[PDB]
Amino acid sequence: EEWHPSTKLGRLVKAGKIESLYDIFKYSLPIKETEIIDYFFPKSELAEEVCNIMSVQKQTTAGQRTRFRAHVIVGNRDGFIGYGAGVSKEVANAIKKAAKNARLNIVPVRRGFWGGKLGDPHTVSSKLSGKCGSVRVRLIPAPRGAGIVASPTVAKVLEFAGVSDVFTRQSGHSRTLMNSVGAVYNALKSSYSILTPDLWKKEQLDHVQDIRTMSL
Amino acid sequence: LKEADVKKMLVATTHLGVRNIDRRMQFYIFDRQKDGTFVFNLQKVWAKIVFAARILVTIDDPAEIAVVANRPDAQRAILKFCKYTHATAFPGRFIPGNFTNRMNPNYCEPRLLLVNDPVVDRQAILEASYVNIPTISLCNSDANLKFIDVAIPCNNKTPMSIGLIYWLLAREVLRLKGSISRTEEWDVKPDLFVAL
Amino acid sequence: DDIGMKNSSGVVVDAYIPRKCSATNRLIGPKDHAAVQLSVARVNDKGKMIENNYVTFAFCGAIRSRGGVDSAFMLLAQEHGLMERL
Amino acid sequence: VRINVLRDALKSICNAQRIGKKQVIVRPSSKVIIEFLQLMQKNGYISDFAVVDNHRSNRIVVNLIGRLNKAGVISPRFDIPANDIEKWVVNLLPSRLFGHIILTTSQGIMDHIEAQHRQIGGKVIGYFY
Amino acid sequence: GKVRTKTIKRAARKIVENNYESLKPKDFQNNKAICSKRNVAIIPSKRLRNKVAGYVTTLMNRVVKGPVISLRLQEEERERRDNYAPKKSEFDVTQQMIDSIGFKCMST
Amino acid sequence: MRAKWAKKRMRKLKRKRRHMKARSK
Amino acid sequence: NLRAKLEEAMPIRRAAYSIIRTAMRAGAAGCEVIVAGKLRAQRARANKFKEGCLISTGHPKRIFLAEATRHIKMRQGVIGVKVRIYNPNIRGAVMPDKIEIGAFS
Amino acid sequence: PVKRRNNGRSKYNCGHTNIVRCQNCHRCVPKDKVIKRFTIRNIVDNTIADDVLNACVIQGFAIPKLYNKVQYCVSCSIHNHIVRVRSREDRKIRTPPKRNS
RNA sequence: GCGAAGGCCGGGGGCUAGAAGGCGAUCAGACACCACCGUAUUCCCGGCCGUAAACGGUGCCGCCCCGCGGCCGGCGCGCGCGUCCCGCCGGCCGCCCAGGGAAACCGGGAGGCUCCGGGCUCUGGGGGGAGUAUGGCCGCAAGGCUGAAACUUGAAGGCAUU
């Protein structure tokens, strides 16, 4: 089958003008092809998670139609986490569709440090809040000895994100795990958008290293 | 400040606009006629066309710039601009999904957008948001600036203004580059840009 | 000043350093697809000829949704010198 | 009626910064408001501030650089022992390392770290992160 | 109830666009020979061919009467208009708005 | 209006119950 | 092969998909499989797995569709494997509906 | 929930409003809720109007036109098709269908 | 202190409509709807009652708050000049960008709030039992206001989708 770039970014990506996935997320690139996430971490691929296989029914004249919906927490412990959801007639099609979506929306986690600094980022940089549906999760920085103390499901998301230590606080119908994992992901997704006092020196914006201007 | 252009612009009516004025466009309008028509200041239009031209010149691949117009009156003009310049065109209906559906028949990933009418070309502006396309817009006096980087205030309705504005932009982008020299006249005639 | 967080020894971390939107000085997120980058060329004394060096800015989608960019552009460029300050 | 003038002020400051507006205007000028702004200038959160006199309350125009996340007040001003400026930082500030809590103390209006150096405490005036 | 279906219509429209010259307006029988031509199209079965040719007769009469499938035989005229530049330009050849800017057109 | 008709039955029972109480007062 | 694979305990989903792939590798335009019966339930269930476009009616299907039915006999009882394969490109016959237009001249 | 933000009544800054009557139902409806149409129509049937006018001995006597206002209750109007049940999107339009006769 | 209606208690008055009541069709029954007649009432005056899906189902004072329209009042600016143009202030509204919410939808807030703290009052804490019992007060009554428990039960509810 091989790979044929259906995306201009994909053509540049195989061409090697862009090295690393971070530079795409710097230039706020929409990512449509899963092949760009797999190609950025090819060896041993990366960990994925089967979560909440579900059986929704839409009523029709004869009766309800059963379609399986699954949610996947693709992530590796480097600060990249993606949660995505896919619904299909069979479980096998749904897990593959959700996995593709989860890989597509891999996002950078700021990670960061507590009061102590040594050289290993071990916690979320600042308390992080995300609301999905009715659940709001608060990801608070933790001491290095303390681990990920969280709901069994959101614990995995923060582990597949390389956040070794976190303080969690989930409020709402957390039992609705699809919303619960989304809130943790939403908090993590906008960790770079929050501006810290360290990002206060203005710099660059030169166009030369932009991956959008890059014409192969 | 081109004196020759302002006499032509006065006949083209790029100085005139709709009676509704948005707060964002208030700066450009000099005043109004008693009947309620609004008089865009002509030199702001010049210092806008040239500003857009400076941004447009940065796009090294000419066809990366994509122009869209469902407005039949301006359809000849966007194409004429594209032929004299080398920008790509999306005339007539937008065939929604062009910007974000990879398998769309006209699927493009432009680096810049030229929307003839912010209201008439509404779908393209929302789609440009999903795929990081900054957009330039020809606008009237009542123009919402939602998802518009830069906007050029022209009559954006009369055929003569709509065609002339594109001629001014095309000449400006080429004049900034090489093509027609900055001082000599363009061989291309403003009239062939306007649709009848 | 090393933009970025730094460990006690040094070593600025923060591999993705976001682009601060110029108008609001607000970092642009990873999935901020609405956020955009526009470059305005520089014109020579000789007939406004392009010198191949262009000032560029990052503009978040939120400012764009409001419509603030059309006036921010004029202000930013004016100070840069790009636009006729008037 | 208008009771905590600081809450009015900070709410307008955060709101104006959210839309990005460079200058924000505060109707009543107060010693406590000016001191919070002086602490914000000291940490650089506010670019510049000036007070226009009306022979009345006095009005304040604040130049915002665009670097302020959130600024809030705590009502009523709760007396904080020097021991408890540990706990208040945990629930009111983003992270132990960064962010500022400002407490009125007999020494003056000072940030949590400054009063932690002096090992003294006062009533919270508000918090700027 | 004889409504030509899309299958008949799609094939018929392509055939006029490909060979407008071969078809004639009031002759279904000539169109049937053109449509039956091995080169023009491979229509399996007599009925589809008979109907597709009937649709071309109506379509041909329509595309001869007016430009109602693009006609390249008519595109040249459109292209000529596309390159048409009026020799005397109507628009190259409020009152105090120019005075306001600083440079006064029609000064006084 | 079942709620209205229910409060009318309660009001009737409460009238009869108070009247019976009075007979044995 | 399907009846043998199913009797040998190869999983239903994979097994139908293995056959589906063989028609796709062969290039056949459409294959379906409708195993039906006590499939992993006390009640009867029907599992239809299909890949590609398959015509269902008209005279063409008689001379353009391939149908085969086997009765598998697992421990539960009778199950009914089915395969339907449609190829427009078989012998010298054309699906009647498609008019073929290929060139300007 | 709130099917209509106007709550079915053009009542603003009022608290209470006057009462009116369904022409056929004779129901009591608040004035704001009432359908309220104004109908101007010929006193004689329009089909017979020309002959009546020609027969009218008076020179240039225009046929008198009746001027009346018809007010119906919601229930009354839906049965008489004065107004039609409309889709949730169509309810928000406030302009007369097909352009007072 | 005020408080729609119905009710009440003394006085009036009395058309209409009209609980009760009577009839006439209908229907298995109809004693209900539809017709016909008709008392209290409706109306007035002095009291009482103290409740309404009394709703905008959104307490009040305070600030910030994004544009676009209408309407009412007062005022101001400008000009051909007219109940014109443009504001301002207080209202009455529609549409909405942000934001918010479980949504419907709010958006002059139901925003500025899990990054939660302007002030002050009121109420709520799964569904019944039960607004019942009993005790208090208030009322001429009708009833109002306050107000349980024993016990039962795994659901009740909201908004949307099919």
Instruction: Please identify which residue in the block is written with the tokens 């029907």.
Output: G46
Q: How far, rounded to the nearest angstrom, does the alpha carbon of residue D4 sit from its chain's CA centroid?
A: 13
3-class secondary structure per residue, D17-78: HHHCCCEEEECCCCHHHHHHHHHHHHCCCEEEEEEECCCCCCEEEEEECCCCCCEEECCCCC
Q: Do D64 and D117 sit in the same domain of this protein?
A: no
DSSP state for residue H62 in the 8-state scheme: P
Give all strands of the β-sheet with G65-74 in edge-to-edge order. Answer: G45-51, G31-37, G77-86, G65-74
Q: Strand I: which bases are under 7 Å from protein Cβ?
A: 4, 56-57, 61-69, 79-81, 84-86, 91-95, 97-98, 100-106, 110-119, 131-134, 142-144, 158-162
Side-chain-side CA neighbours of residue H55 (13 Å): 6
Containing structural domain, residue D120: 69-129
Resolution reading in Å: 3.3
Nearest to G54 by CA among G34, G70, G74, G80: G34
- Spacing of D27 CA from I117 C1' in Å: 22
Between CA E63 and CA E66, with CA E65 as vertex, the angle to 5 degrees is 65
Distance from the Cα of D115 to chain C's closest Cα (Å) equals 24
DSSP H/E element including A15: helix A8-15
- Give the tokens for residue B85: 């310049």
A127 CB and strand I closer than 7 A: yes
- Which of A196, A121, D46, D47 has its CA nearest to residue C3? A196
Strands G77-86 and G65-74: antiparallel
Same domain for D30 and D52?
yes
User: Do D50 and D36 fall within a single domain?
Assistant: yes
Q: What's the rounded Cα separation, in Å, for the pair B166 and B171?
A: 9
* Look-up of token digits 């392509």: E14
- Which nucleotide lies closest to F7 by the C1' atom and the CA atom? I131
- A211 with B132: CB under 8 angstroms? no
Please indicate, yes or no, whether residues D63 and D41 belong to a single structural domain of this protein. yes
Note whether D6 and D47 are same-domain residues.
yes
Beta pairing partners, G65:
G86
Which domains are delineated in chain G?
Answer: 1-86 (3.30.1140.32)
Same domain, D62 and D73: no
Residue in D with minimal Cα distance to C62: D19
| Measured distance CA(A22)–CA(A34) in Å, rounded | 15
Nearest Cα of chain B lies from the Cα of C20 at a distance, in angstroms, of: 16
Whether residues D25 and D42 share a domain: the answer is yes
Annotated binding site of H: 22, 24
Exp. method? cryo-EM
Strand order in the sheet with A128-132: A128-132, A135-140, A166-171, A148-149
d(CA A215, CA A204): 20
CB contact (8 A) between residue E18 and residue G104: yes
Altogether, the residues listed in chain A come to a count of 216
Positive or negative, the CA dihedral C76, C81, C84, C85 is positive
Instruction: Tell whether D57 and D93 lie within a shared domain.
Output: no
- Rounded Cα distance, A21 and A108, in Å: 9
What is the token pair recorded at B160? 């003569």
Number of Cβ atoms within 10 Å of the Cβ of B27: 12
Domain map (residue ranges) of chain B: 5-196
C37 touches strand I (CB under 7 A): no
How far apart, in whole angstroms, are the C-alpha atoms of residue B90 and residue B94?
7
- C-beta atoms of B100 and A30 within 8 A: yes
Q: For residue H41, how far is the Cα from the chain centroid?
A: 13
Look at chain D and report how many structural domains it folds into: 2
Q: Enter the DSSP assignment of E42.
A: B
Count other C-beta atoms under 10 Å from residue G82's C-beta: 16
d(CA C25, CA C19): 9
Nearest to C30 by CA among A46, A164, A82: A82
Report the residue from D69, D94, D97 with minimal CB separation from A113: D97
How remote is the C-alpha of G11 from its chain's centroid? 17
End-to-end CA gap in chain E: 73
CB contact under 8 A, E102 and B76: no
Residues 6 or more apart whose Cβ sits within 8 Å of residue D113: D100
